[PDB]
């Protein structure tokens, strides 16, 4: 088995402006975001390729969970602002947490918060306890550890629940995270009025991201004039391109090369003038 990671990110604004939800939540599986929630629509919604997956998560029930989390998260931010006696300004709280396994073996976990960008507080499941970084975080620590069960719970989530959730998700996400969708390349050229002609090689619909793409002018690996790539989450695919300008008086042969983990041997698409 390989590496897989479940990560959640919560963002709250104490004084949100128009069209910007006061709270937002999102979760990623490796390099793909599989869900999102916000305080406006108030609903846990699957994303990308997970929109078509069934039986992995009762989104209607998670919606309720997210509302719960939201209330706590926002109460947390509220209290910090109360602490610094400054509710006229706008402040943000960001929570990041999750776990990761490698070879069906839990290989890591984390749970930390940031207030106005600086480290606010984090959990050390080895004590187990909360570690404060900001003075206000001391008050939070006190609250979050008022009962002995609390740290036990936080610990249980990081070492049991989260990874359990990750294993489950992996079952329903094989046809997603373990894909080897080979790239469809496409060579094309454009002549800007006044400039040299330029050749653009485009590899698309491939997954994972790691990939090699370069032009060759006479079997010689050229230096790209402009490079670029992207990730389409809804699709769950990657695109990557390279461009080269060709001398107005050049006849040499131009071919595009594309190496990808899903190819038995590299691909070569020559450009026909
Ligand atoms: C995956 O999604 C991407 C983005 O929606 C698709 O890329 C577009 O493909 C159309 C052709 O149908 C092009 O005309 C667009 O220019 C592309 N969007 C851009 C600018 O990236 C891609 O076709 C989809 N492929 C799969 C496997 O469904
Ligand atoms: C780890 O994977 C095995 C199958 O490879 C599965 O039976 C097991 O339940 C998973 N996690 C553990 C150790 O329970």
Swiss-Prot record:
Domain Ig-like C1-type residues, every copy: 183-268
Example GO biological process: antigen processing and presentation of endogenous peptide antigen via MHC class I via ER pathway, TAP-independent
Gene3D superfamilies found in the cross-reference section: Immunoglobulins, MHC class I-like antigen recognition-like
Organ and tissue specificity: Blood plasma, seminal plasma, urine, saliva, sweat, epithelial cells of various human glands, liver.
Gene Ontology molecular-function annotations: protein transmembrane transporter activity; RNA nuclease activity
Post-translational modification as stated in the protein's UniProt record: N-glycosylated. N-glycan at Asn-104: Hex5HexNAc4.
Assembly mode: Interacts with PIP.
One Pfam assignment: C1-set
Keyword entries, A-Z: Disulfide bond, Glycoprotein, Pyrrolidone carboxylic acid, Secreted, Signal
Function: Stimulates lipid degradation in adipocytes and causes the extensive fat losses associated with some advanced cancers. May bind polyunsaturated fatty acids.
Cell division listed as a keyword: no
Source organism of this protein record: Homo sapiens
Alphabetized PROSITE patterns for the sequence: IG_LIKE, IG_MHC
Family from the record: Belongs to the MHC class I family.
Glycan attachment points: 85, 88, 104, 235
GO cellular component, one term: external side of plasma membrane
Disulfide bonds: 99-162, 201-256
SMART domains in the cross-refs: IGc1
Protein's name in the database: Zinc-alpha-2-glycoprotein
Transmembrane annotation, as ranges: none
Annotated localization: Secreted
Gene from which this protein is expressed: AZGP1
